[PDB]
Design a protein around this ligand. Structure first.
Ligand SMILES: CC(C)Oc1cc2c(-c3ccc(C#N)cc3)cccc2cc1C(N)=O
Length: 272
């Protein structure tokens, strides 16, 4: 990785201007700026609830994981440098933004949506094959290149029972919320993503009943077609029902009843 200067990333991102303007996005633990190094467009994630030493631990984890983990379905770290992390620029941002059509981008078709699901699952498979638990699988963390290839991101929380429960609540597994660290938690979160992919509905909505997307698993299991994202003209009952079946299996309340990433991957390939 290239050891950048904590200064050469300032003038590439126009003195860290947080407008739509040099700011693509924002999350917890930091801000994502669009920089231009050499002839390469980059994503510089300046790190900013959590303590100062805890950002450093998440900075070093990110480096350590990215050093050994290289897959076309994982974003690539180019380097780092106050703490910065420079990544390959994803021209199509996050899956969350695309599902919401943020900044007027066209709605992803079901065809692309099936390819992204397979891409994301391959990315997770590499991580689990290499004995890594992501610990924060969510559509904001599934990035998209110019060809809409799904690239999983954010390995700061990743691990090769805990006191510091961390992650996104709307996506979290019951045992994860209780502080358990198992790759089975990642499966559960991927099932939430699968539900966002089918419905175009975000995992959490303040001004919506149910507020939590995963509560539709119950709504449909009691009373699915009614939830398919209407901003699609190319979806079909069989492939939609086949993706839902995977999400339903992923969303099993009991971690041990859930399928492993290899099975999920296989089931998503059986879709096409
Ligand atoms: C490796 C990361 C830093 O790269 C990107 C993060 C992006 C985000 C983002 C994603 C997740 C959260 C959360 N939680 C917050 C912001 C939004 C929009 C576009 C993005 C593009 C990139 C990129 N590399 O082009």
């Amino acid at each position: 990785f290239h050891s950048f200067s904590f200064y050469e990333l300032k003038n590439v991102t126009n003195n860290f201007d947080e407008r739509p303007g040099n700011k693509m996005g924002e999350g917890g633990f930091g801000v994502v700026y669009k920089g231009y190094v050499n002839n390469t467009t980059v994503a510089v994630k300046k790190l900013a609830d959590i303590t100062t030493e805890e950002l450093k631990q998440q900075f070093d984890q990110e480096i350590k994981v990215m050093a050994k983990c290289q897959h076309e379905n994982l974003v690539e770290l180019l380097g780092f440098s106050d703490l910065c992390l420079v990544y390959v620029y994803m021209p199509n941002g996050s899956l969350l933004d695309r599902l919401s059509c943020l900044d007027g981008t066209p709605p992803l078709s079901w065809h692309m949506r099936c390819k992204i699901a397979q891409g994301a699952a391959n990315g997770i498979n590499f991580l689990h094959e290499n004995h890594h638990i992501h610990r924060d699988i969510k559509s904001a963390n599934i990035l998209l290149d110019e060809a809409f290839t799904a690239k999983i991101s954010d390995f700061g929380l990743a691990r090769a029972m805990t006191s510091r429960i961390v992650g996104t609540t709307a996506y979290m597994a019951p045992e994860a919320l209780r502080g358990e660290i198992t790759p089975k938690s990642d499966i559960y979160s991927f099932g939430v993503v699968l539900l966002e992919i089918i419905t175009g509905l975000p995992a959490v909505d303040e001004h919506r009943e149910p507020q939590l997307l995963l509560d539709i698993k119950e709504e449909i299991e009691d009373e699915i077609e009614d939830y398919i994202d209407k901003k699609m003209n190319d979806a079909d009952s069989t492939s939609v029902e086949a993706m839902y079946s995977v999400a339903s299996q992923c969303l099993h309340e009991k971690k041990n009843k859930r399928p492993d990433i290899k099975k999920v991957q296989q089931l998503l390939q059986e879709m096409t």
